[PDB]
Amino acid sequence: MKQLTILGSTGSIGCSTLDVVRHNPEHFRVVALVAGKNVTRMVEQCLEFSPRYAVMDDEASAKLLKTMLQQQGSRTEVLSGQQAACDMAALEDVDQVMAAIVGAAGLLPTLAAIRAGKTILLANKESLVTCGRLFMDAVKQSKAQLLPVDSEHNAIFQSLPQPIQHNLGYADLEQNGVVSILLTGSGGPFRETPLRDLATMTPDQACRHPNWSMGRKISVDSATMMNKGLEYIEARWLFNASASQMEVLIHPQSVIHSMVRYQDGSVLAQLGEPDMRTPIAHTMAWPNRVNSGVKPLDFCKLSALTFAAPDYDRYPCLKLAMEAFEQGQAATTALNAANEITVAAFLAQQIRFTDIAALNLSVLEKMDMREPQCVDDVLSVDANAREVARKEVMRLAS
Amino acid sequence: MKQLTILGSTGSIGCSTLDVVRHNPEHFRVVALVAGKNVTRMVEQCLEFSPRYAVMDDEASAKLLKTMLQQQGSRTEVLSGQQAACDMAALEDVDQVMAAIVGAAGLLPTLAAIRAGKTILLANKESLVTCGRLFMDAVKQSKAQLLPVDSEHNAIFQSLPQPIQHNLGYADLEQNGVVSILLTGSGGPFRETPLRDLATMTPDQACRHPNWSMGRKISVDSATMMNKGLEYIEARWLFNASASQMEVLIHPQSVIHSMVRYQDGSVLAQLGEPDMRTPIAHTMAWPNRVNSGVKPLDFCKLSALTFAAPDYDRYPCLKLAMEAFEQGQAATTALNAANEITVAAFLAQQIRFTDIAALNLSVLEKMDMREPQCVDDVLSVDANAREVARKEVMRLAS
Ligand SMILES: O=CN(O)CCCP(=O)(O)O
Numbered sequence A, B: 001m002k003q004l005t006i007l008g009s010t011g012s013i014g015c016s017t018l019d020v021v022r023h024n025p026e027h028f029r030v031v032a033l034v035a036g037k038n039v040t041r042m043v044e045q046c047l048e049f050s051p052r053y054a055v056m057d058d059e060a061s062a063k064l065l066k067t068m069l070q071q072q073g074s075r076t077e078v079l080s081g082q083q084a085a086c087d088m089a090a091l092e093d094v095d096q097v098m099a100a101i102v103g104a105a106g107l108l109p110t111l112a113a114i115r116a117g118k119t120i121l122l123a124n125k126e127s128l129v130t131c132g133r134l135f136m137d138a139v140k141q142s143k144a145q146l147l148p149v150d151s152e153h154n155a156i157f158q159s160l161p162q163p164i165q166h167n168l169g170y171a172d173l174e175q176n177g178v179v180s181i182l183l184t185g186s187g188g189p190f191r192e193t194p195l196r197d198l199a200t201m202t203p204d205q206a207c208r209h210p211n212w213s214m215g216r217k218i219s220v221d222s223a224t225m226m227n228k229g230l231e232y233i234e235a236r237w238l239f240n241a242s243a244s245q246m247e248v249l250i251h252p253q254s255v256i257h258s259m260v261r262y263q264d265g266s267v268l269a270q271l272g273e274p275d276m277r278t279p280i281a282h283t284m285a286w287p288n289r290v291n292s293g294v295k296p297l298d299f300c301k302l303s304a305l306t307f308a309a310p311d312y313d314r315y316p317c318l319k320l321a322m323e324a325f326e327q328g329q330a331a332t333t334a335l336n337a338a339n340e341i342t343v344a345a346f347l348a349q350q351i352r353f354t355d356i357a358a359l360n361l362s363v364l365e366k367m368d369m370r371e372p373q374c375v376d377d378v379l380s381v382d383a384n385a386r387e388v389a390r391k392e393v394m395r396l397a398s
């Protein structure tokens, strides 16, 4: 049996993970849950799965949680704060850590799992994006295996040969017959919205994906295709791909999740319901398989599958991300940080949908700092870009 | 370097194989070519690749070939007949045998390659279909590895886990996380032809596939979906799949070549240009890859990808094949044999398109023989069904 620390347990991916545990009680045990402020969701999960430990980011949420747990008589112990999360990620009995915190705040707990040599179920793209080569070196240095949970990188992983799967980020694509990695592709809810209407789209419209049901941050990123931008950066580290070994396609139907192009002309792809339980279950059971709760994809009830090149006038954030990778790690760390601040500002009705790409661009220009040489440098660049992004947001606020 | 005997070299798959050798002269050498009666094509191939040996099925064709080769001064030696083909398949220096003869006539040379422990690039579905468990036992008994060349089984193979790839036909699908195998799917050139017009379709119309450019036999089988019927039978042996582990879909665009359904909801698929060089190159280079001459699939210039359940009123041959597998090996051997005779009769303008399924059904009913216990029994059943099918054809001739 394999035992779990879930980072970001109350989130969309966290809840999907627990649903896989739920369907496979004889294969998977949760030792620790880590979350932020959603106390009701966390109390549901603690009462259901009886984890050894539960961590909340702030102490007030931890107290509310503990009060309810000791009333019901739960054996689950409650802690709070970032260091507690890092300790939960490194517990001896833990085999796998689901890294599903949103944003760069997930970085330190994820790195702690990595240093403890844990199998990392990686669903926190912002951490690899913001940390890059330093993240990949921490993985190589330790006994840890990365297993991509994000739907796209998971599909790529499944469609890659074993020498790459077993040496992720360090193996040579070309020697293993890989020509390129095909990153798809939904296009968001406004793929067919007139360009000139984009600025009037509300947070609720942006968070309503036709196919996916995920968190608000990721839904907005899908709308701007910053999600694909972040995944483009991440895929380059995870799979050791150059710019010429990356293609980005829009696939509106979200059936194909991504693909790998080989030298003989073959393209290998993963398909399925747009449901995170599938890629999560893939990583948790790898190299075997388990039921994930997701039913068989019915090919006779599908929409016709299409593809299209991304239009950078529609999706300026994609351009920003792809070019940030070329500009280096400081620009990338700062882009991620800015986008966290501007997406939050959009969701809090402080700026418009199209202001995200505008202010992200502005922050990048105003950033003037050196390439990070360590994790502390990554965090200084992050914190600084957050400060500049907050100032820029105030630039377009009522 | 790997060295080749090609069985059926002058055919569509044979020519596609030689094109892969052509693009990879430093990886692949042809020791022997085996063909039938197409002397011009065979002389082209002998003069180009300078094989050690060339075999033609009849002695008159061998003579015409030899006359031209010794005029030009070629070192290639010419032989004729079936036993010669079997010897070519077992030469010491041969590493791989492309089994690309059409029909059950390919059986004996393919079995000779198998007994010699050769890597079998298997593109002769009629042989496995007609020989079944006996074929798979010959493979298991010897040192031979099957590598499926047919576009569909190749796609399945690429989309299967390594434990299955390395123990093909004997490994358990369910233990390796496989729920089912999804066999696709073109539907032929008459997929959208009114049912009532099918009977007026000519051989030239039947042989014009929108996507594939292959031999006449396989093109007619694609039109009736007997191709899928034969591939259904073959896939059950190759992948150790039961009836409940097989799904058959129409995919009109021939981009997806087939798929594998896993327990967590994942579906793995191979995609590409509908071009046999790709699956051929996959098998020849396995577990590595080579350029096959096929260019990268352009997803931005594709038709929208669709799927549909097969309609047995449109494709009665599919029903015949799927039910023949249940009826056992004699019925299957006899169905294949009948279909070879009736497809030939259709191409020779002796019967109509729709007469293929009718006479195939008739032959099956008239067959009354025991399940084959050995290869000789397989050939008696085959020869007998050919005789009955010829008689039935005469039933509807002018
Ligand atoms: O893990 C799943 N995702 O990343 C969501 C994909 C939505 P997009 O294709 O619009 O980025």
Ligand SMILES: O=CN(O)CCCP(=O)(O)O
Binding pocket: B149, B150, B151, B152, B184, B185, B186, B187, B188, B212, B221, B222, B223, B227, B228
């Ligand atoms: O190897 C390639 N084929 O089998 C040709 C497929 C044509 P179909 O899908 O109509 O059977």
